[PDB]
Design a protein around this ligand. Structure first.
Ligand SMILES: OC[C@H]1O[C@@H](O[C@H]2[C@H](O)[C@H](O)[C@H](O[C@H]3[C@H](O)[C@H](O)[C@H](O[C@H]4[C@H](O)[C@H](O)[C@H](O)O[C@@H]4CO)O[C@@H]3CO)O[C@@H]2CO)[C@@H](O)[C@@H](O)[C@@H]1O
Length: 160
């Protein structure tokens, strides 16, 4: 199916760490879609390099990082490995994503997070809206009962 639910034993411990490190429910929804374990132990850079490499629990790409975060603004494409610090600093990870979205606004943040630099050309394309929709649905689920902020339930969407 398009979407569903699964139990990830222990995940509620990591949910609470995220919410105790400056994250909000909206951040948890984005992280929940990105990885099953709310973790950073996917392949380095998510298998990608330079502006496309992904770091942190949200799999933020280096283009977004270097253009919209206080921690990385001004840095170059070639400096992309600097983003890896987010894989082991959850607070900086959370802070960077929030600053990125507060720099670009939600719509353009979605576009550049999903489609990189070329997504900023038009944030309202269907592939971006599909991603937006998925994060909205997961947030609606987490927001429907406070238990979902501390139990081991994961709401997932297959964003084709
Ligand atoms: O694209 C955005 C974001 O996606 C990330 O991957 C997600 C993926 O989007 C989706 O949420 C995925 O959920 C899995 C889920 O964990 C279960 O394994 C599930 O299974 C099956 C399901 O139970 C049903 O039986 C269905 O009919 O068949 C499924 C397959 O057997 O399937 C879901 C769909 O895959 O979880 C991953 C994260 O692990 C990342 O790719 C990220 O980079 C990305 O930006």
């Amino acid at each position: 199916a398009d979407r569903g639910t699964e139990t990830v034993p222990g995940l509620g411990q990591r949910k609470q760490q995220i919410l105790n490190s400056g994250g909000g429910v909206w951040d948890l929804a984005i992280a929940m879609l990105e990885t099953k374990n709310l973790g950073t132990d996917y392949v380095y850079g998510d298998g990608k390099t330079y502006d496309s490499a992904n770091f942190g629990i949200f799999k933020q790409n280096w283009f977004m990082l270097r253009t919209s975060t206080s921690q990385f603004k001004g840095q170059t494409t070639n400096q992309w490995n600097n983003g890896a610090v987010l894989n082991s600093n959850l607070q900086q990870d959370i802070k960077a994503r929030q600053e990125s979205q507060n720099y670009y606004g939600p719509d353009k943040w979605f576009a550049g997070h999903r489609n990189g630099e070329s997504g900023l050309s038009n944030p309202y394309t269907q592939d971006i809206t599909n991603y937006k929709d998925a994060v909205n649905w997961i947030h609606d689920q987490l927001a429907s009962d406070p238990k979902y902020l501390s139990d081991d339930t994961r709401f997932w969407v297959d964003v084709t």
